[PDB]
Amino acid sequence: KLFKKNNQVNRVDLDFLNLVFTLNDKDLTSYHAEEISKLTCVKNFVEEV
Amino acid sequence: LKSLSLIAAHSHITGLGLDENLQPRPTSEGMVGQLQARRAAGVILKMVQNGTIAGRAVLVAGPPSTGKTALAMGVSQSLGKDVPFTAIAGSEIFSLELSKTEALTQAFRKSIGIKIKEETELIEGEVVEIQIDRSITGGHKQGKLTIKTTDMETIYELGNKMIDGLTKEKVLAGDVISIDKASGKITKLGRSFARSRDYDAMGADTRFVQCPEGELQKRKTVVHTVSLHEIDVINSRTQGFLALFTGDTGEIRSEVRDQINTKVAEWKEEGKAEIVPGVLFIDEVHMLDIECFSFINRALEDEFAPIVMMATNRGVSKTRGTNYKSPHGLPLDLLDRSIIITTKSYNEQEIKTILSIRAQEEEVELSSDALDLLTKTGVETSLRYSSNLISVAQQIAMKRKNNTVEVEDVKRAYLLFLDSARSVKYVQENESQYIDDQGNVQISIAK
Amino acid sequence: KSLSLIAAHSHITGLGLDENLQPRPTSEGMVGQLQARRAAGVILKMVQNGTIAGRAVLVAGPPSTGKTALAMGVSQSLGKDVPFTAIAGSEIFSLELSKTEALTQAFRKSIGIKIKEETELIEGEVVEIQIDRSITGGHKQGKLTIKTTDMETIYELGNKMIDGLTKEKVLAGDVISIDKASGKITKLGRSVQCPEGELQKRKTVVHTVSLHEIDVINSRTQGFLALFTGDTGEIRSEVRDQINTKVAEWKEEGKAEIVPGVLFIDEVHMLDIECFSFINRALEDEFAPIVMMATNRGVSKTRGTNYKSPHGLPLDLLDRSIIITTKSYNEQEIKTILSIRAQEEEVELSSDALDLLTKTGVETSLRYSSNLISVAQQIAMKRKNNTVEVEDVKRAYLLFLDSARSVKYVQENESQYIDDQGNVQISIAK
Amino acid sequence: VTRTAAHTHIKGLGLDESGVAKRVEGGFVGQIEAREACGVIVDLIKAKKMSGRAILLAGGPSTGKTALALAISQELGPKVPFCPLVGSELYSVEVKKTETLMENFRRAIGLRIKETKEVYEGEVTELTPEDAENPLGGYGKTISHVIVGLKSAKGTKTLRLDPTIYESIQREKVSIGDVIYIEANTGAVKRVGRSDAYATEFDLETEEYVPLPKGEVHKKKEIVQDVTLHDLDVANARPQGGQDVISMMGQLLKPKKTEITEKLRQEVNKVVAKYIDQGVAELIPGVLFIDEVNMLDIEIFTYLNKALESNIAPVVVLASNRGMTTVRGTEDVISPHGVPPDLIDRLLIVRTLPYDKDEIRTIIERRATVERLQVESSALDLLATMGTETSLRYALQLLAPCGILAQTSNRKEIVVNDVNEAKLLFLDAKRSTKILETSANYL
Amino acid sequence: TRTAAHTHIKGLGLDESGVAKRVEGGFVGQIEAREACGVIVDLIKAKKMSGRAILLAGGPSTGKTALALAISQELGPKVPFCPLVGSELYSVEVKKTETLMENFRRAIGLRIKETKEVYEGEVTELTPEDAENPLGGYGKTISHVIVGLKSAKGTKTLRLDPTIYESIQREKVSIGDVIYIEANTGAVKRVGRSDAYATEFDLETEEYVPLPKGEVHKKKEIVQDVTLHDLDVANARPQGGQDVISMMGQLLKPKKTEITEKLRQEVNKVVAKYIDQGVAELIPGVLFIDEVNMLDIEIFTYLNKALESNIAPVVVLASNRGMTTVRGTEDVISPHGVPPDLIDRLLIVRTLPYDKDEIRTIIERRATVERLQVESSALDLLATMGTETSLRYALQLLAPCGILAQTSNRKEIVVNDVNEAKLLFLDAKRSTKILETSANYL
Amino acid sequence: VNKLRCDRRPIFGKNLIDLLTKDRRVKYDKSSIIDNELIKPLQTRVLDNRKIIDTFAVLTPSAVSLDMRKLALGLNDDSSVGENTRLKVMQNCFEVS
Numbered sequence A: 001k002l003f004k005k006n007n008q009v010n011r012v013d014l015d016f017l018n019l020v021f022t023l024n025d026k027d028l029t030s031y032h033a034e035e036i037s038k039l040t041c042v043k044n045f046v047e048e049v
Numbered sequence B: 001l002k003s004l005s006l007i008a009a010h011s012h013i014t015g016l017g018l019d020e021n022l023q024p025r026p027t028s029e030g031m032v033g034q035l036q037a038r039r040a041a042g043v044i045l046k047m048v049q050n051g052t053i054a055g056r057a058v059l060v061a062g063p064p065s066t067g068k069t070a071l072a073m074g075v076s077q078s079l080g081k082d083v084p085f086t087a088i089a090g091s092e093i094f095s096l097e098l099s100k101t102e103a104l105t106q107a108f109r110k111s112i113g114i115k116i117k118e119e120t121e122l123i124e125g126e127v128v129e130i131q132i133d134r135s136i137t138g139g140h141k142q143g144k145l146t147i148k149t150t151d152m153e154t155i156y157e158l159g160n161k162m163i164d165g166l167t168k169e170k171v172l173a174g175d176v177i178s179i180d181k182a183s184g185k186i187t188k189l190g191r192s193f194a195r196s197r198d199y200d201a202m203g204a205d206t207r208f209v210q211c212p213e214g215e216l217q218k219r220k221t222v223v224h225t226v227s228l229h230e231i232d233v234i235n236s237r238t239q240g241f242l243a244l245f246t247g248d249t250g251e252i253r254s255e256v257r258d259q260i261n262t263k264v265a266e267w268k269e270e271g272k273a274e275i276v277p278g279v280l281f282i283d284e285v286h287m288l289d290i291e292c293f294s295f296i297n298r299a300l301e302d303e304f305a306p307i308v309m310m311a312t313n314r315g316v317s318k319t320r321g322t323n324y325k326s327p328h329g330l331p332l333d334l335l336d337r338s339i340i341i342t343t344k345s346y347n348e349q350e351i352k353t354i355l356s357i358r359a360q361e362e363e364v365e366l367s368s369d370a371l372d373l374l375t376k377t378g379v380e381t382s383l384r385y386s387s388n389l390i391s392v393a394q395q396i397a398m399k400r401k402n403n404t405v406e407v408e409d410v411k412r413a414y415l416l417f418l419d420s421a422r423s424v425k426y427v428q429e430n431e432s433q434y435i436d437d438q439g440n441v442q443i444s445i446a447k
Numbered sequence C: 001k002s003l004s005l006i007a008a009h010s011h012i013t014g015l016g017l018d019e020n021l022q023p024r025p026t027s028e029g030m031v032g033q034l035q036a037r038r039a040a041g042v043i044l045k046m047v048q049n050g051t052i053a054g055r056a057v058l059v060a061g062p063p064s065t066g067k068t069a070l071a072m073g074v075s076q077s078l079g080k081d082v083p084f085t086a087i088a089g090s091e092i093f094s095l096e097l098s099k100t101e102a103l104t105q106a107f108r109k110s111i112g113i114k115i116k117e118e119t120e121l122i123e124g125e126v127v128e129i130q131i132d133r134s135i136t137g138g139h140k141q142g143k144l145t146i147k148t149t150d151m152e153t154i155y156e157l158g159n160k161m162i163d164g165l166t167k168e169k170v171l172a173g174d175v176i177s178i179d180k181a182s183g184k185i186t187k188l189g190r191s192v193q194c195p196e197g198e199l200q201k202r203k204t205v206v207h208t209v210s211l212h213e214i215d216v217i218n219s220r221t222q223g224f225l226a227l228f229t230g231d232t233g234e235i236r237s238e239v240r241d242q243i244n245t246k247v248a249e250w251k252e253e254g255k256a257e258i259v260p261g262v263l264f265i266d267e268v269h270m271l272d273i274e275c276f277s278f279i280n281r282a283l284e285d286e287f288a289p290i291v292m293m294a295t296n297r298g299v300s301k302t303r304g305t306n307y308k309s310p311h312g313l314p315l316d317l318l319d320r321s322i323i324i325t326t327k328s329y330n331e332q333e334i335k336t337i338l339s340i341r342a343q344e345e346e347v348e349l350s351s352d353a354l355d356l357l358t359k360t361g362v363e364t365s366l367r368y369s370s371n372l373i374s375v376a377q378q379i380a381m382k383r384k385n386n387t388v389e390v391e392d393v394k395r396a397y398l399l400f401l402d403s404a405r406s407v408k409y410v411q412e413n414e415s416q417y418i419d420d421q422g423n424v425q426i427s428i429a430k
Numbered sequence D: 001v002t003r004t005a006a007h008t009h010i011k012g013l014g015l016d017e018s019g020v021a022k023r024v025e026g027g028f029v030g031q032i033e034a035r036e037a038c039g040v041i042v043d044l045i046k047a048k049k050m051s052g053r054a055i056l057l058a059g060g061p062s063t064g065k066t067a068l069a070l071a072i073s074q075e076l077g078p079k080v081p082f083c084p085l086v087g088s089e090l091y092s093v094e095v096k097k098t099e100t101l102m103e104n105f106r107r108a109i110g111l112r113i114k115e116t117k118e119v120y121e122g123e124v125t126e127l128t129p130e131d132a133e134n135p136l137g138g139y140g141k142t143i144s145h146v147i148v149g150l151k152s153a154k155g156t157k158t159l160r161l162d163p164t165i166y167e168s169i170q171r172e173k174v175s176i177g178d179v180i181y182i183e184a185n186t187g188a189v190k191r192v193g194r195s196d197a198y199a200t201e202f203d204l205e206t207e208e209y210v211p212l213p214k215g216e217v218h219k220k221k222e223i224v225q226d227v228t229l230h231d232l233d234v235a236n237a238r239p240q241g242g243q244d245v246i247s248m249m250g251q252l253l254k255p256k257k258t259e260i261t262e263k264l265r266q267e268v269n270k271v272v273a274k275y276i277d278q279g280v281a282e283l284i285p286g287v288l289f290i291d292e293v294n295m296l297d298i299e300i301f302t303y304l305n306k307a308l309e310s311n312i313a314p315v316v317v318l319a320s321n322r323g324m325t326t327v328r329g330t331e332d333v334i335s336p337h338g339v340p341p342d343l344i345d346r347l348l349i350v351r352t353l354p355y356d357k358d359e360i361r362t363i364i365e366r367r368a369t370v371e372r373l374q375v376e377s378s379a380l381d382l383l384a385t386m387g388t389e390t391s392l393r394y395a396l397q398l399l400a401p402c403g404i405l406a407q408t409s410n411r412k413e414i415v416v417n418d419v420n421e422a423k424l425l426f427l428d429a430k431r432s433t434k435i436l437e438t439s440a441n442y443l
Numbered sequence E: 001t002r003t004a005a006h007t008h009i010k011g012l013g014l015d016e017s018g019v020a021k022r023v024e025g026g027f028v029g030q031i032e033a034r035e036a037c038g039v040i041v042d043l044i045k046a047k048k049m050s051g052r053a054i055l056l057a058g059g060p061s062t063g064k065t066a067l068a069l070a071i072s073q074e075l076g077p078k079v080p081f082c083p084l085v086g087s088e089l090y091s092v093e094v095k096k097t098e099t100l101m102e103n104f105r106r107a108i109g110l111r112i113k114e115t116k117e118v119y120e121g122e123v124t125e126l127t128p129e130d131a132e133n134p135l136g137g138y139g140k141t142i143s144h145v146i147v148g149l150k151s152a153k154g155t156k157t158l159r160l161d162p163t164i165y166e167s168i169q170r171e172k173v174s175i176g177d178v179i180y181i182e183a184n185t186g187a188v189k190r191v192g193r194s195d196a197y198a199t200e201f202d203l204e205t206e207e208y209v210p211l212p213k214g215e216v217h218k219k220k221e222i223v224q225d226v227t228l229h230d231l232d233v234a235n236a237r238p239q240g241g242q243d244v245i246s247m248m249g250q251l252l253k254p255k256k257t258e259i260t261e262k263l264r265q266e267v268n269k270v271v272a273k274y275i276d277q278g279v280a281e282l283i284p285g286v287l288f289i290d291e292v293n294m295l296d297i298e299i300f301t302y303l304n305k306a307l308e309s310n311i312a313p314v315v316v317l318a319s320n321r322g323m324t325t326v327r328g329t330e331d332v333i334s335p336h337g338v339p340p341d342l343i344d345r346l347l348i349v350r351t352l353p354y355d356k357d358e359i360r361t362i363i364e365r366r367a368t369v370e371r372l373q374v375e376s377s378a379l380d381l382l383a384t385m386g387t388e389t390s391l392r393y394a395l396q397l398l399a400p401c402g403i404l405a406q407t408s409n410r411k412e413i414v415v416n417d418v419n420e421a422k423l424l425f426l427d428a429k430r431s432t433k434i435l436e437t438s439a440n441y442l
Numbered sequence F: 001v002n003k004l005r006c007d008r009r010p011i012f013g014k015n016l017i018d019l020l021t022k023d024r025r026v027k028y029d030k031s032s033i034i035d036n037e038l039i040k041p042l043q044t045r046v047l048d049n050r051k052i053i054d055t056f057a058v059l060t061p062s063a064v065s066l067d068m069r070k071l072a073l074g075l076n077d078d079s080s081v082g083e084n085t086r087l088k089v090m091q092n093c094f095e096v097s
């Protein structure tokens, strides 16, 4: 409890940034990942902005 | 450029300086001299690129700081990507977890690559709406759903098993999904942009994607480049894919290896998978156990044996695990089934050209007299001793904030950092101050 | 408490000194070794000061000449609440842990951390407890009555403490303690005890924890179990760096204070050269407990090396350390030590028997006499006389051999015993 | 109060803007050439250009080698990573020495990460599930959305959440009156605790109470936490996610070192290079320091040659004191400083000279001033003489008991009688050896 | 099309019960050696002996491993054959004795042959047959179940006992779906819907299989083989989905363990029981060990003990050393590094070095294998070089001459190409001379 | 939201989930043999050896400490694990045979 002093000020999740990719192979395939990378919804937020 | 751009010892060298006639230019591709060695390296590279020959061992010989490691790095660079190239040190194979023979086996299996192609029939598209008559009939009343793409859209009839599968991973329309034609697997790709404003806090899995374009279903082929050792590791364990990253392979038995060999031969005969021979490079092989040498001798005579190149700067000396001294630091039986390439020490002109190319590599400009003094020092000293002096002199010049490196800065750098011979002389002159082999040492200056 | 029958260092307790650090001729079971005792007192005051850390002190002397006794007295005089680790040199050679890691763990075990936490709690005899099930009017209503010597009142239970109290069977009339912050229940016994006053009181709880324990706790999902099972397994260095930084912040914030205890290593002479090289660096860092060592051997071969080094240690380590030498005991000191040991073992010795025992100890060794004192008593109650006479001592002396007599007999009868080459004779004739 | 252990009186190399070392600066005296060389090395490290460059400094015992190796790190600053090491620590039971050396090499170089996160936090005023009346055929019963209002000191705000966050907060077991914490990025929900406003609700309560948070409801912030690549490799090799029972069992097991494959390091390098190209992160090379390198085996020496030629190899410095000696693990190879000749060729050599009597006296004066002790001039001169007679470290260690001896007599100054008494009570190596020469039983 | 110092050996090159020919099966010379090898091949093919050990000794590059490869080829793929190295036995995970015993057991194989009667085809209909119950009752009683099977070039209907109801209900197969039924064992197995029903739906998660070809009733014989070590490891290693030991195998690392002798003897007993019925057929294999001089003396002793077992197969050993000292003993000197007691337990087969003409024939045959053409002068020069330096050096030099000829756009190698190869590529002797004549530590 | 969506997309399986099953996929058919009666896995040997186990198991761990098992497994009333996760763990242990 004494060591659990607030760390969110100086901590990074490290999974949101895709640095723990070693477990991605358990559920994702290559072609689906390639398609999901190709099918990004970018350029729509720009239009709305 | 994809790798980390930190400047290393071997950065200037890129590929080989050979031509279509295998004639090495005097100064090309960041290499100087060693015309015979470069031609031999080009011959070996063409041998590897041919791919019809396997199980050959080539030795590289030369005194320290002659270009053996540089030659191997240039060979790897000229080979390019898509071809495996395993570079390990001799002392690396000594592992507590794995036997040395198994480590050598894994290193050999890593160096040989395999390309596998796979074909898939997928139906990917955003779903318009799903209707199921749960009350008119009840119990898989053959509901219907409409899938829309940017160019086309149709309506499909769904069976009982379709409804049962779709109940799991519930879909509320307006989502981009892909269905498998063979096994009927439901995969949720992502939601549409129209759902972006539904809430202010999204879930972890929530994502938005554009509508797929083209035909509703497509036939595509994918090619994977996976080496053998990965295949043996995966087959050996229930979850072997983690063992690659963790490294605890666990001394894979030979039974799995022969099963994998049979499977690979069958795939090659069917044409699904092709074999890409690679190159295995062992550096500082002068140190190794005799058991490793015997295992290498035996394993060099297999069909899946990549071309092995080794380097050694040792003369006639003792081999580890044996009391007697063997020529070149290796047992004679290995030398029998091998080809030796020798490299000669560089000349003053070669040394100064290499120094100039190194200074240009580090974005460091040098005065002509400074270069001449550096070459003169590197003739008596070693070539490798000059590059560190160059970097230190550049740092000193930056400290003085005067453009190029001057002769005075080089002299100061040489004064600050000593050569091995000077250190040996100073130690011998003051042998009392340093700790002797017997543990005796003198601390107090006063007598 | 602290059960123990008899120890070779049981008699000595707390060393012995004065306000001017002048050793007494006999104080709390310590006899002789005036210079050594004064040096030990100086080291003890250095430890109690705490301003200087990471210094090495060596203890040297002939075998069985006040060497482990000095360390035991230093530890006893240092008192409790101060870390003190005493490990033999051969203990660090572990099959599952590296020698460097074991040495680092031993170093970290000798620095203790005191942390203070303030908690509120209530206690006293409980006389009434009522608990009801959920109704639309109220999810859970629970009233309990705790009566003390001065007070008796009723508290309201808001669900969670109702579940806690129903978790374990509680009967009215027994002394219990309730920690409001932690929400745990502690039973102090039945009303055997008596209450004291106000139910709620202000107090702080202080915990003494070493650095090694903190590292082990923070190194695993359940690290505190490894404190006892010993399967820590090479704690990562970044964990130790993080612990050091956090301890520095805690000290600067006043939440904790450090206790620079003492690390005592015995039979250092047999430690490997790698251990000495690592100690060289480990003694020069910030957090480093004082280190005291004792080696019997002198001018021998360092283990792990071919050459012979003085005192059995490398020269650089000797430079890093300070050497304290003990002297051989004298007859008037030997007799006093034997008398003290007899008093500790509750054995009555006659004057002539004591003189003969002192003569034998001077002739052969002190340990021989300090072992003969106990064995003579068995003959003493074999003759049913409480006092030990010269006859019993002589009978024990002839019954149990000495090192010199055994060596001489072996030299005379080497034929019967197994030779180094393996030759031996079993047959009597021919 | 303040602790001192043969160090902490050195605040840095102490060099001017022209690189010339002052005679006395930062707890250092003399060794101008060594200090200048170390400053040059510091500048090279801060250049962030060269990789794999190695230097070695050599000299007799107590010549300041460790002092210089600490002063360079002090001058570098806490931001740049610096991992001290000893040659003996490489030999590990769990994994081979090569793996440990590579792990330390990757520990040496560091990297900083910047990412932006938005957090909704505050006391829970109310929460309301919203169930759509249309079955739509695709589902049986689910909540269309959940509306939750958050309150803090600066103001209040309401939110609309999808069923996943609602399920998470329901699992968190939070009712009205508890301070919660919502992370927009990953949807993480954690219950900080009950607000202190309800402290008097019951006479006693197990739950702790937390003051109402500042900020309106929703905050934007970024974290610039710096993490070395070795931590990334360890996290990739040892994932912490998953609620599976097998994952809990794995968490219970002790973490054993394993030979991390080069493929994993290559993938980590690729993603790090992509991020640094995107500008979201910055790579900072570090410094690795190994002491008593003579303890290393020939195999580690050989592997050092291959390691130093890598792309991401940091700057490594080495310390040694022996002269003409045989490399460990060999039979007759005699090399200076116990280092194989090829490695010596690869590195640079720095020499450390011994100290003069006046320099020793100044060192003693500075050390005594650091220890906050008063020493008479005559006593200090005697200490300098006896230190020159036996060793500097002997005098430095003897400086401590003299203070206790003076305190026992209640005087506040070091007197010749006190140091003489200390010398009587404490013997140096030479006296111990001399008395060891003539003794009965090993003394 | 890849070759590595081998693949030009096709059998032992013998004839029909006689002395081996001069050139046959890629073999030249050493007629006595391959004649003895063929005798050994006949002996193992007899499949009566147990624990017969032979050893071949000779100089380097004398076809020592080539003869082992030849006998392996002659034995055939069905006969097990386990190549091994002297350095294989040193295993960190488990003691050397266990590894040697495991290899011994892996050498022995076993073949299983089975015949099955299969009734397969599309399910035309399923109609129960009613009959009067033997015991008086008002409930419905079924005496037979009628199943119709349809296949390519034949259809049939079968009358079966009514107990097939449980199996047909379990398989969840209804109509127009291909099923498999065994004659005597009974039971049914659904294999997939008929391909004719594929178009009945726009989408389908279930595959459709084509109707079986030929008659609905089939009689196919299946042959399966497996070595004894596989049986032992399968018996020892647990299997399962959710039993505690199943994922205790998970979250841990499966490692080799010393298999007890009771498990091995139980496996032997069950194998004997099955082979007494004629279903099984044991076939001994051959274990090949190279550089046997590198084995420890303890391993030699365990080999001495194990060679007297009743299940030990034929082992073949090779060594290129002479009067040397056995590893693990500084004083014991025995030929080829094998202790004298072990040598007493086996037979020694000599090997002789080749001649100039034999070297030239080997070089030309290798060149034919490598699909490249040389000239007579170049071939003679290569043969002279091989006789001078070594045979293996000449064999290795072949590919660089081909590459050099390709660079010069030539199809055949000439003297100039082999000279360029000789100046570019060095052998052992010149390298040793350079080392002697150089003081730069090279 | 744009930044979050863009960052959450490039999550690549390092090798695959279909490569794994495609390399597991053995073209060799079921080919049922007497190997079912020949293998006799460990669980079957435990099951059919009930009589010997019952007759020859005698000794007991004379010294035991209850409630230590839960602490060793890390699950109890108070620990660093979540209540729901530990509840699921005990449920699984309850339903695992």
Ligand SMILES: Nc1ncnc2c1ncn2[C@@H]1O[C@H](COP(=O)(O)OP(=O)(O)O)[C@@H](O)[C@H]1O
Pocket (backbone or CB within 6 Å): B009, B010, B030, B031, B032, B033, B034, B062, B063, B064, B065, B066, B067, B068, B069, B070, B071, B313, B354, B384, D342
């Ligand atoms: N052809 C070349 N052109 C430029 N530099 C070279 C060449 N050959 C070697 N070098 C230099 O030599 C160094 C490598 O020497 P190396 O061969 O590793 O020594 P060793 O023979 O002891 O392994 C590199 O720093 C490289 O700059």
Ligand SMILES: Nc1ncnc2c1ncn2[C@@H]1O[C@H](COP(=O)(O)OP(=O)(O)O)[C@@H](O)[C@H]1O
Pocket (backbone or CB within 6 Å): C008, C009, C012, C029, C030, C031, C032, C033, C061, C062, C063, C064, C065, C066, C067, C068, C069, C294, C296, C337, C370
């Ligand atoms: N000053 C002393 N007073 C009482 N007993 C002592 C004293 N010095 C030594 N002893 C006795 O000597 C024993 C310790 O022997 P020690 O000198 O530590 O052996 P070593 O020198 O081999 O470490 C103890 O059992 C103790 O009874």
Ligand SMILES: Nc1ncnc2c1ncn2[C@@H]1O[C@H](COP(=O)(O)OP(=O)(O)O)[C@@H](O)[C@H]1O
Pocket (backbone or CB within 6 Å): D005, D006, D007, D027, D028, D029, D030, D031, D060, D061, D062, D063, D064, D065, D066, D067, D068, D321, D363
């Ligand atoms: N130039 C100097 N100025 C001040 N103190 C020094 C100097 N040189 C050495 N020392 C002191 O000597 C002590 C030990 O020296 P160290 O460098 O550890 O010896 P070694 O070089 O054998 O490792 C250090 O605590 C340091 O304070």
Ligand SMILES: Nc1ncnc2c1ncn2[C@@H]1O[C@H](COP(=O)(O)OP(=O)(O)O)[C@@H](O)[C@H]1O
Pocket (backbone or CB within 6 Å): B333, E005, E006, E026, E027, E028, E029, E058, E059, E060, E061, E062, E063, E064, E065, E066, E318, E320, E362
């Ligand atoms: N009769 C033969 N015909 C063709 N090649 C042969 C013949 N005998 C030996 N060889 C060659 O000799 C090599 C085998 O060498 P070998 O004698 O097994 O080495 P070692 O003596 O180290 O065991 C093979 O590559 C093969 O090409």
Ligand SMILES: [Mg+2]
Pocket (backbone or CB within 6 Å): B068, B069, B283
């Ligand atoms: Mg090299």
Ligand SMILES: [Mg+2]
Pocket (backbone or CB within 6 Å): C064, C067, C068, C069
């Ligand atoms: Mg003692």
Ligand SMILES: [Mg+2]
Pocket (backbone or CB within 6 Å): D061, D062, D066
């Ligand atoms: Mg030092």
Ligand SMILES: [Mg+2]
Pocket (backbone or CB within 6 Å): E064, E065, E066, E290
């Ligand atoms: Mg061979």
